[PDB]
Design a protein around this ligand. Structure first.
Ligand SMILES: CC(C)S[C@@H]1O[C@H](CO)[C@H](O)[C@H](O)[C@H]1O
Ligand SMILES: CC(C)S[C@@H]1O[C@H](CO)[C@H](O)[C@H](O)[C@H]1O
Ligand SMILES: [Mg+2]
Ligand SMILES: [Mg+2]
Ligand SMILES: [Mg+2]
Ligand code: NA
Ligand code: NA
Ligand code: NA
Ligand code: NA
Ligand code: NA
Lengths: 174, 1014, 211
């Protein structure tokens, strides 16, 4: 499963468990903060340093990465394009596709970026309410796990993918 | 596979399913393709499969993949497993049969495990492609071959195809299919019908070569007068492209080849990147094409040959071609340049024994009956049909509305899913794969976006998709008010002729009014009208008068063709017709599954003849001795028609003749009747004309009657006073009775009740129940509506009658006197019917018994103006005698009511007593005959101007009994003779639908009867 | 669709925005192979519909675009009509398949010249002055791309603006484009230099066409 089902080679599967799209949200709990467009305590930025390891294919990703930080991984800035960090080469082509034209298939050698972050969540977020993660841009497709458990999948590199993490989080480190 | 619940994901409607396409057979011989003979490359797997039932897919043993379960049984496929008894079929109308929680379905999800062990020859696997086709699987399935998972599919009503080439081995193979009753697809399959499940259409294996015809589209365009046509055929291939490859499209009229084109692959430039190298478009000139219509279904045969330049055939496909243009112009729907008048019916795929499995015999039976009853169109309510239906419609000549399998009726509001972009992918496939399948069938003239799913943006997108892909057919859709931006045709359901129904947001305007709303230009054709539930089709004539007067009123589709009743068996193994709730299915919508013009076994309801008469293709007028015949055919002359005419005096034939019909389409013929001899005796002369088809057709037998009409000619009123009698009736008085004696005859009037309680001829009683006034009827389905004991609808007629006390009003005597006259005895009575201190009805009568033995009854009734208008005004009694025949002078022969009597003719009719009862599955008032001047039963004769029914079943038993099979013949015969009887209605069956002119509102009523012995 | 802050800033500083779906299938043969294929309608629909759902409240957005260089397919017409139903407040444009198809409210050619016709088969680029008055044509014309500013370029730019000012229905266009897509690289001395196609071992590539 997940390796079985090549969702990245099926135009009928463009997402799994993704929430509905919507206009920009901040979930203010104060009217005046909403009016003045000031920061919201309910909207948290995960633009910090993550852990990153590069692979030549999803099949080369070790199964331990779901549970544990890989010691081979580097700490990098997110958001980022990994070619800008030197892991593989950026490609400039105009009309001709950068891959063989054979829809829906992509090359077996499919560069894979394994990202991870250990983080805390306020206790109050676990008692009540809904906590979602939002990826404003992932190029070109991705699976997501929270605390070792599979959450969902997304496509389209230029629109946000959102997923409910309420059932997944725990007290302390996630 | 268990992980990943794809049947709870509208984002997953299939896995590894092949592209949709028009019917394929992969002939390897051109001549076999041309003649439409069977193809060795198309194998039927319609045989006995192995089947096992589970309450949930979690209960399916993993061993079932590799090996047959010994627990499983051997069952016919195609089938619905409810018809085998594994679980119960559910009848619900609007409310979903599962909890409304999209995308989720119940954890208890009946799962049907089908399997088959079969042979494949090595030749099929050496080269080419072997695919399996499931034409119908309800409602979602996973497929395994030789243990290995192949794929997954949704949409119950379109074929699902999978490539098995890599899965099969030469020799023994095993297919395993896990069918789920409920899926996220169920949210889009909420049609008002039995909810069933299973592999209910054909399963087949198709062998295609690697280099193959993968798709082809046939278009026909015309010059202004249809004397010239171009057939355009777009053909697509799969496999490796090669310079030596060619396509030949040839066109045939029988065995004469009319035109042919050959080209290599490589379409014209499309955009900056080129064209379609894998496609070719062939164009053939056809001079003076024979045009297709429902009137004359001219077909050609197109053969599509894929071959080498040197002439080796690779494969051929083929289809029937009908040359016809469908367009909307200046607000009119045109076929071949002529405005259509749709004589349509909605038709569900239903068989009482086999459920939703269709067969050729039943399909053919249906078409024959439809054409025989002047229908020219059918709507696929509400899903793509079995593929053979379209072929039969192509060949017999019927216009088809092809409708996508999308119904979300039970959502709140109705467009909750169709306005949701997340449901667009699921919706899009149900539309797109229908068009790709059916687009070559000439019988399909209109595409429909589905049914009762409100109006959402997804409709507007899919509307536009079909308009881009196929400009040859208008797109209609009724949802969200029947005139939205997603429909080319104003297509309301159950909009009335003259009465507006201004529901907020989705009004149903009077159809005459709707046409001329500010800015409205479109044609109007009702997708559903004249709800034929039980004793219905009251007011049908009103629709047709309007359709004929208004150009832009172009007809409609009756709801509907055939009762969705199912067969059950009693303890004696005797069959009976069952409806909602008869399978422990709950909640249910009872008899609402039965709305057909015909019974489940295709026996007609009386309403069918009313439809035949109103849908006639010849209109008639009489002026003096001249009959004017007008044709409503648009294309054909009347070259298999003769007019029979007959003049009769009160049922007694006086003269007859026949004249061939020779009427151009839309033309007129004048027929001058010869001088008719004068009758000596009194009475009304009646003229009846009939249109007879001397020759058999493909759809009818020799002597078939297609049209009729009747007129009153001269009337000579009787002025002769009857022969004076010498006998004078004798009055005998007691405290309890007035008795009258004359010869061997006796009459008895009870002085406490005020009614004639008994009658003797010789020594024998004639009555089992006294002759009493009656103001009620065993309620029709139209009277009942959607009311229930637990949820009263106070607006329904039955509930108004009940609440006012019509059914429990007791007769109270006001007057009962007897006077002896010169040559008669006169009994005078008066009664009041009261309920809780309120006087509902008053009945004042005289009975005059003279020396000739005749009893003249004069009846004058008052009806309180503030009580709901009564169902009938008449008398009833239980006669002691059961006679074999019923003879009457009046309207017949079939059941007819005041708002459904145009089909009936005035004449002398003689039928067995049993034909005077209509076996409606839900019993009600039935078998009435109107305009009756004389009624004969055994020794009795009644005369006057009355309506009557006569049977072994009392009104009380009829209203107390919920199924026809539970009815028992009572002692003697119940006779109901009415001076007046309310309309039956039927514009719909969930609101009062009896028109004001058929309600008994006059306040004061009068009728007279003569009762005598012959 | 852009980084969400782009629309905020455009709202606040004042720029008219064309918000464009992430669909380009330029390399297909022919260009509409996928976009005329109903099997690609779901994937395409999400790219259009989820954009509208995100950006529909930004005043700076004045036009919706169905994507770019994907020919003209039936999926375009479906999605054109979807937007027109869901949001009547903004015209829908799309250039693919000849700039003036049934899937666009605006004639929006790329690199149509002022006076010179380019009568390519199937997808001609008419003079913009001539395009407006073709028999039956009534729509406004605004080039989605014009004046390819590659290297020493923008010759004849003045000729566009004279035309735009003389003809009411010629309502301008969008220069191609704002900023060179060159990438910083480093020599052996650690000195930065501007790099283009081919400079990363990337092959096949299109060299300086990224600038
Ligand atoms: C308001 C309800 C009765 S809806 C009504 O039910 C009918 C029952 O036969 C049919 O299904 C009609 O199509 C439907 O509109
Ligand atoms: C025929 C090709 C040059 S297409 C041409 O390439 C340009 C290169 O900068 C741009 O990408 C244009 O949008 C494109 O139409
Ligand atoms: Mg995918
Ligand atoms: Mg699903
Ligand atoms: Mg319904
Ligand atoms: Na008409
Ligand atoms: Na029904
Ligand atoms: Na009953
Ligand atoms: Na201008
Ligand atoms: Na460029």
């Amino acid at each position: 499963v997940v390796l079985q089902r090549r969702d990245w080679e099926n135009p009928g599967v463009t997402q799994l468990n993704r929430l509905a799209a919507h206009p920009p949200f901040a979930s203010w709990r104060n009217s005046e903060e909403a009016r003045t467009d000031r920061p919201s305590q309910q909207l948290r930025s995960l633009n910090g340093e993550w852990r990153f390891a590069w692979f030549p294919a999803p099949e080369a990703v070790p199964e331990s990465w779901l549970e544990c930080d890989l010691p081979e991984a580097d700490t990098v800035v997110v958001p980022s394009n990994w070619q800008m960090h030197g892991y593989d080469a950026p490609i400039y082509t105009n009309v001709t596709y950068p891959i063989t034209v054979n829809p829906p298939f992509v090359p077996t050698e499919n560069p894979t970026g394994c990202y991870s972050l250990t983080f805390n969540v306020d206790e109050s977020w676990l008692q009540e309410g809904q906590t979602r993660i939002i990826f404003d841009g992932v190029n070109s497709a991705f699976h997501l796990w929270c605390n070792g458990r599979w959450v969902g999948y997304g496509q389209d590199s230029r629109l946000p993918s959102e997923f409910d993490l309420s059932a997944f989080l725990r007290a302390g480190e996630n | 596979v268990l992980q990943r619940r794809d049947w709870e994901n509208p984002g997953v409607t299939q896995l590894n399913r092949l592209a949709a396409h028009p019917p394929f057979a992969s002939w390897r011989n051109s001549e076999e393709a041309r003649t439409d003979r069977p193809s060795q490359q198309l194998r039927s797997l319609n045989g006995e499969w192995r089947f096992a039932w589970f309450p949930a897919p979690e209960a399916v043993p993993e061993s079932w993949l590799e090996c047959d379960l010994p627990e499983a049984d051997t069952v016919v496929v195609p089938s619905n497993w409810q018809m085998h008894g594994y679980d119960a079929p559910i009848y619900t109308n609007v409310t979903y049969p599962i909890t409304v929680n999209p995308p989720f379905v119940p954890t208890e999800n009946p799962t049907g495990c089908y399997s088959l062990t079969f042979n494949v020859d090595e030749s099929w696997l050496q080269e080419g492609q072997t695919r399996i086709i499931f034409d119908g699987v309800n409602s979602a399935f996973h497929l395994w071959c030789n243990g290995r998972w192949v794929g997954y599919g949704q949409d119950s009503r379109l074929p699902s195809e999978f490539d098995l080439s890599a899965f099969l081995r030469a020799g023994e193979n095993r297919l395993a299919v896990m069918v789920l009753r409920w899926s996220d697809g169920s949210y889009l399959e909420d049609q008002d019908m039995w909810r069933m499940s299973g592999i209910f259409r054909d399963v087949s294996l198709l062998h295609k070569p690697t280099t193959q015809i993968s798709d082809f589209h046939v278009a026909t365009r015309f010059n202004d007068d249809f004397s010239r046509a171009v057939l355009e055929a777009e053909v697509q291939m799969c496999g490796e492209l090669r310079d030596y490859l060619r396509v030949t499209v040839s066109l045939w009229q029988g065995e004469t080849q009319v035109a042919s084109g050959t080209a290599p692959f490589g379409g014209e430039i499309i955009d900056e990147r080129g064209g379609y190298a894998d496609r070719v478009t062939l164009r053939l000139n056809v001079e003076n094409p024979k045009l297709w219509s429902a009137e004359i279904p001219n077909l050609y045969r197109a053969v599509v040959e894929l071959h080498t330049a040197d002439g080796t055939l690779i494969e051929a496909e083929a289809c029937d071609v009908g040359f016809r243009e469908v367009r909307i112009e200046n607000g009119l729907l045109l076929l071949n340049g002529k405005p259509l008048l749709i004589r349509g019916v909605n038709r569900h795929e239903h068989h009482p024994l086999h459920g939703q499995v269709m067969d050729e015999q039943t399909m053919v039976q249906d078409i024959l009956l439809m054409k025989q009853n002047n229908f020219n169109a059918v709507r696929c309510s509400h899903y793509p049909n079995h593929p053979l239906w379209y072929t039969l419609c192509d060949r017999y000549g019927l216009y088809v509305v092809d409708e996508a399998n999308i119904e979300t009726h039970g959502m709140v509001p109705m467009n909750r899913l169709t306005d949701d972009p997340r449901w667009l992918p699921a919706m899009s496939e149900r539309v797109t794969r229908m068009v790709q399948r059916d687009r070559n069938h000439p019988s399909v003239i209109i595409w429909s976006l589905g049914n009762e799913s409100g109006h959402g943006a997804n409709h507007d997108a899919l509307y536009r998709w079909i308009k881009s892909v196929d400009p040859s057919r208008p797109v209609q859709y009724e949802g969200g008010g029947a005139d939205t931006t997603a429909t080319d045709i104003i297509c309301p359901m159950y909009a009335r002729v003259d009465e507006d129904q201004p529901f907020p947001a989705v009004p149903k305007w009077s159809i005459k009014k709707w046409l001329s709303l500010p800015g409205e230009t479109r044609p109007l054709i009702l997708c559903e009208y004249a709800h034929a539930m039980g004793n219905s089709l009251g007011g049908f004539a009103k629709y047709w008068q309007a359709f004929r007067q208004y150009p832009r009123l172009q007809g409609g589709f009756v709801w509907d063709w055939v009762d969705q009743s199912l067969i059950k068996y009693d303890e004696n193994g005797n069959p009976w017709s069952a409806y909602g709730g008869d399978f422990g299915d709950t909640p249910n919508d009872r008899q609402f599954c039965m709305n057909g013009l015909v019974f489940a076994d295709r026996t007609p309801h009386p309403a069918l003849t009313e439809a035949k008469h109103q849908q006639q293709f010849f209109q008639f007028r009489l002026s003096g001795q001249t009959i004017e015949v007008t044709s409503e055919y648009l294309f054909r002359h009347s070259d298999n028609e003769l007019l029979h005419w007959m003049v009769a005096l009160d049922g007694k034939p006086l003269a007859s003749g026949e004249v061939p019909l020779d009427v151009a389409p839309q033309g007129k013929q004048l027929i001058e009747l010869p001088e008719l001899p004068q009758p000596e005796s009194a009475g009304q002369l009646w003229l009846t004309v009939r249109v007879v088809q001397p020759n058999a057709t493909a759809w009818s037998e020799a002597g078939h009657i297609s049209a009729w009409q009747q007129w009153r000619l001269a009337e000579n009123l009787s002025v002769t006073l009857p022969a004076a009698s010498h006998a004078i009736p004798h009055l005998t008085t007691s405290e309890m009775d007035f008795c009258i004696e004359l010869g061997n005859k006796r009459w008895q009037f009870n002085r406490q009740s005020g009614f004639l309680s008994q009658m003797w001829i010789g020594d024998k009683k004639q009555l089992l129940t006294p002759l009493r006034d009656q103001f009620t009827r065993a309620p029709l389905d139209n009277d009942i509506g959607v009311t229930e004991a637990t949820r009263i609808d106070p607006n329904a007629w039955v509930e108004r009658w009940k609440a006012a006390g019509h059914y429990q009003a007791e007769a109270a005597l006001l007057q009962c006197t007897a006077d002896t006259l010169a040559d008669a005895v006169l009994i005078t009575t008066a009664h009041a019917w009261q309920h809780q201190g309120k006087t509902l009805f008053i009945s004042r009568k005289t009975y005059r018994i003279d020396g000739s033995g005749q009893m003249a009854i004069t009846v004058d009734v008052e009806v309180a103006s503030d009580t709901p208008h009564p169902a009938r005004i008449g008398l009833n009694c239980q006669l002691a005698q059961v006679a074999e025949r019923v003879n009457w002078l009046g309207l017949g022969p079939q059941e007819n009511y005041p708002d459904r009597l145009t089909a009936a003719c005035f004449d002398r009719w003689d039928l067995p007593l049993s034909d005077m009862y209509t076996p409606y599955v839900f019993p009600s008032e039935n078998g009435l005959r109107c305009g009756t001047r004389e009624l004969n039963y055994g020794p009795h004769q009644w005369r006057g101007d009355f309506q009557f029914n006569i049977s072994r079943y009392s009104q009380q038993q009829l209203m107390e009994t919920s199924h026809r099979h539970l009815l028992h013949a009572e002692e003697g015969t119940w006779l109901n003779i009415d001076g007046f009887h309310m309309g039956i209605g039927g514009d719909d069956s969930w609101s009062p639908s009896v028109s004001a002119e058929f309600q008994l509102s006059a306040g004061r009523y009068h009728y007279q009867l003569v009762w005598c012995q012959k």
